[PDB]
């Protein structure tokens with residue numbers, strides 16, 4: 402039903418909220434929820450772990466079956482699979498992990514995958530333990546994504562820093 406509420410409007414197509422993406426999926430019932438994935442779709446940590454546990458491991462079982470037949474994704478690439486009880490679809494997107502020396506230019510390719518979907522609920526790509534500068538990730542999102550994106554950032558201090566920086 403895509404019932405997004407409580408978001409700050411950054412641009413005509415980008416919105417942001419201090420929220421847990423799992424609780425937003427449950428409230429919103431989005432057509433697409435984005436997972437901040439890795440290339441072998443191992444959902445043990447961070448956002449991926451939180452989404453998988455909220456599906457009672459159904460997302461990991463589906464992902465393992467996908468990987469056995471298709472192999473891993475590339476950094477900057479994506480894969481649409483079921484959204485299970487959280488969304489109609491889950492768009493698994495691999496942003497570069499700069500803490501492991503991956504190419505930051507691939508963050509643009511990662512966000513370009515969002516343009517295949519009219520509206521998405523998403524986390525801030527390559528942020529947190531992936532090490533990219535979160536202000537840079539938001540700028541890449543705003544400059545790359547043309548479709549409607551609702552960003553859930555589960556950290557009040559980070560949310561306030563991003564909003565303050567964007568409003569300069």
Ligand SMILES: CCNC(=O)c1cc2c(N[C@H](c3ccc4ncn(C)c(=O)c4c3)C(C)C)ncnc2[nH]1
Pocket residue numbers: 420421422423437438446447448449451524525526527528529530531553554555556
């Ligand atoms: C209480 C259950 N929910 C969560 O743990 C949770 C965590 C959530 C979250 N995390 C953000 C984030 C973004 C990109 C990432 N890319 C790769 N990896 C490995 C991450 O762990 C990762 C994490 C950080 C930057 C705040 N963003 C929204 N919603 C959330 N929910």
